[PDB]
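Thread: Modeling a multi-component assembly for a lab meeting

Hi all, long-time lurker, first post. My supervisor asked me to bring a structural picture of a complex we are working on to next week's group meeting, and I have zero experience with this. I have the sequence lines for every component (710 residues in total). Could someone generate the structure of the whole assembly? Inputs are pasted exactly as I received them:
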Amino acid sequence: MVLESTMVCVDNSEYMRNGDFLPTRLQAQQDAVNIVCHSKTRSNPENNVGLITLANDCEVLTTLTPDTGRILSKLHTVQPKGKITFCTGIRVAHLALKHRQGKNHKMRIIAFVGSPVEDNEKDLVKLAKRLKKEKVNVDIINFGEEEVNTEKLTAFVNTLNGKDGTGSHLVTVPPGPSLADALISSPILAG
Amino acid sequence: KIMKSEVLRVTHELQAMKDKIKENSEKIKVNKTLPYLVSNVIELLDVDPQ
Amino acid sequence: DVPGFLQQSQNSGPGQPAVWHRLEELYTKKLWHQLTLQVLDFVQDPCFAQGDGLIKLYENFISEFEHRVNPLSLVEIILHVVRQMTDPNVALTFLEKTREKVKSSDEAVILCKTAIGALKLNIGDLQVTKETIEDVEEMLNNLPGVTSVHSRFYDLSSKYYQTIGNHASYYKDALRFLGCVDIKDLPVSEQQERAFTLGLAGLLGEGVFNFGELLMHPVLESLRNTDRQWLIDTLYAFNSGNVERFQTLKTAWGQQPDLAANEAQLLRKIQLLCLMEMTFTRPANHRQLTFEEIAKSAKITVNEVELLVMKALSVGLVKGSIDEVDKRVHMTWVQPRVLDLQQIKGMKDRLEFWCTDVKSMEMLVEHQAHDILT
Amino acid sequence: LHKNDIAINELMKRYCPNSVLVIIDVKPKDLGLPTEAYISVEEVHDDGTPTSKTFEHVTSEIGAEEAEEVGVEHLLRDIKDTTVGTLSQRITNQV
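Re: Modeling a multi-component assembly
Sure thing. I ran the full set together rather than chain by chain. Output:
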């Protein structure tokens, strides 16, 4: 089947409980993690899935393991503190990819971004140059917005996305009362 | 019901305890299998000065 | 009430629609965090305090049933409600209502009891307010040492410093206020009185012997350059030693209120500084001295030097016991506690001398000792 | 001692009890005792600085209870015991 590692980064800021969008969509994207981990489990149950947030003091909630039975429990107690942290959020997983058991598992990291990015374009091109340098599949998922959705993040992805053939895809969700599961399951990354 | 949403984590910890007691409770059968001899017991209360 | 809020929201004063445009846009967008930031922007602006009585109750209710944003903003805006209304009767029901409303998610009880005690620190009650202040400092001694809540605790120690009962605690918390300052963003025009009553409070502080901790930090000597140097001069003289009595006499009579009764105790405090400096000036070369230097530097008679050294031993900063027959002054361990540069250079001299002497003895003994014994 | 050690030690402060810290050397060229016990406790500072994690030096001793003394003594066969007298005293008094 498919031998690859899955890393998800979820936001724990207070920007995920606003009443305009879904009613505390944290549970909705939790169900998204549930359907992508159970979908990858149905495709290849040997894939390991890690859990970590993007707070100031990043903490590895669950080590990369195919057993999601305790991951379901670890998805709770999100500790809604902090706002956003991007640099050590990338470096806390993309550098931790070397601690996986199976060396044959490809590198794939996703992230749920629910807060505006605090890093300037220089950090976007330095981190994009680092990720394109080490050649890691990066899927950017941006939930919620305050300013325009993609102004510098467009060039961030275009400069970050190498190997145009069957490479990485960008997930941009527009506002709407519909669920996010079917909207993020539309690209080829899900399934 | 937002304050009562933390009970799920407690129930997950308790069912995790029920999932983890099977090993340390399982060694009871191999450690407490058979007393090989018989020994008389005489009760005598002692004092240490928990 | 959302369709019913547009009427009183749109209709406002002449300049209010400037913030009511983005306020109603963020209100229709239902962004509770941006709405909260706009509320803090409206309260932070110097409003006329005339037509805001409606938005205080409206945003009070919205902050009550929103149950999303940190209710500390509600604490601040309700401090502006009790500050604008000046009604302490309903303040207990409002703050208690916030206590009943705020669930057990974040430890905000320190700021809740801080606001309650702060509002109760008026002439109505003092003792129970001091007790609940001790409860505030007693509750949370954990890792969140942001010290901002403890800086408001320093404000409560200032309203407690309004009482002449205890001056020592305001200096102990005033060291924490000395160490918790981040930048000069807060008004310097207030820092004039902050350093004024901070210097006077440090002088009147009877729970400390040296003043070098206050003057040692560069933020106060850097924030006192604008102020008149009549206090910096007497703080440097009180720190580095008072060899004359004319300047300390003119500044001893310069501050008229509350300094007459404390003047004698301040003399009993500064009479030890000449002792610690006279015993730490000469580290070696016949440290033994006589009462002539004490009586000469303190312009006191020979009959009171025994009570002077008896008080010096009663304070506990010195352990000196003299086995003399004819009047002599032998001293012991003492702490400078402020600074000494000639003792830093002399520390390098005597330290390097000790090191090269130990090295000389090591090479001398080990030189032939290693060759004959190994 | 790097700055990140407060975050590394903070995990075992949350999950585990108060953790002791030991700094050693990668090369055994230091003549001093390689082990230094640093307790992870927060102390109040007089200058007014905010309360932070402080590593106070706790004294340590290197001893073996029953078997490691025998194993070390057999594996070395070069070190000497206490041997009060001339050599063990004069070596300390020289070096």
